[PDB]
């Protein structure tokens, strides 16, 4: 069987830095929460911002940016149709929903979250 990947990226909303020179860094917000795995129930979502460089950031061409290397996770399946079901189920169990896209040239399922759950 082939080995498929699942990159789980977080949606970053980047903007130019304000007045302050190094003008190739960025100011970027995103969402985050933290839950407990067996009690569940869901919790309030906090927002947060940070600074990065144009190198670590890749946008999806729509202007939603993302990291250049995200949290990958792989498996072994026959075709893409099966790894689709498997990976979608996995994302529904571990609280990931978002921009689903399948790069066949690399057997990768990039899903952009726009959120960051933690346990």
């Amino acid at each position, epitope marked *: 069987m082939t080995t498929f990947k699942l990159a789980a990226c977080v949606t970053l*909303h980047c*903007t*130019n*830095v*304000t*007045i302050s020179m190094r003008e190739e860094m960025k*100011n970027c*917000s995103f969402n985050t929460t933290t839950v407990i795995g067996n009690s569940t129930g869901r919790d309030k979502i906090q*927002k947060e*911002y940070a600074l990065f460089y144009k190198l670590d950031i890749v946008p999806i061409e729509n202007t939603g940016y993302r990291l250049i290397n995200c949290q990958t996770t792989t498996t072994e399946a026959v075709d893409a149709a099966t790894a689709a079901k498997v990976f979608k189920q996995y994302a529904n169990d571990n609280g990931i929903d978002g921009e689903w896209t399948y790069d066949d040239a690399t057997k990768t399922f990039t899903v952009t979250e726009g959120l960051e759950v933690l346990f």
Partner: antibody
Amino acid sequence: EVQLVESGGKLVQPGGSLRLSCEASGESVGDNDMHWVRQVAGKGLEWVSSIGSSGDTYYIDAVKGRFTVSRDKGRNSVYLQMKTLTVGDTGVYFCVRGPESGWFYHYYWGLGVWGRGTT
Amino acid sequence: DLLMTQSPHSLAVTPGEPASISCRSSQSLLLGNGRNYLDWYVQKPGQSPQLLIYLGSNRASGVPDRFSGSGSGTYFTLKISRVEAEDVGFYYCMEARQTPRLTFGGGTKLEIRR
């Protein structure tokens, strides 16, 4: 769906005091900037005061030192205590839900929610 | 402090024809993110104000495409391509660069000609 209801407006002697209220129904406004804007004879608009999520307050110079704004997140309400009132303070007072405090550089969608006003 | 000047104070337009209103700020409203913090609001008779344009040129939710905003820096214009009877009312611009401090323009009265 948020709904704002202002109350407390009434006739008061010059030099007296009065307490205005903004009650929020349908959502929490705890992390939002809240604004007080007045209007004379249903015509013209003047921003008067504002309070942030963290309790930071802002006033126009004409009312500085005489008006004090507060909020109660447990009651999901905002309050305006006014003292040593003058005829120049007559008018209708609207309470307006603003953006989330401090995030306007990334997320600004305008002033969406207005109250009914109190006279 | 900062001042917002609207012009004209009032205008009457024949239905179907365009209207143009001008809001001028004493100081530039452009921020480092390259968006202009200038809004347009409408107040119809007997109702509270309701947002029309946010961040200079972006139509608010529910607003039809007949309404358009343009301009930059210290000069902004609100244009209604085709006026309908329902557009009568008062129009106010608002600066938000000093958020949480705000400043409204004097307002413009939009009447309908018949």
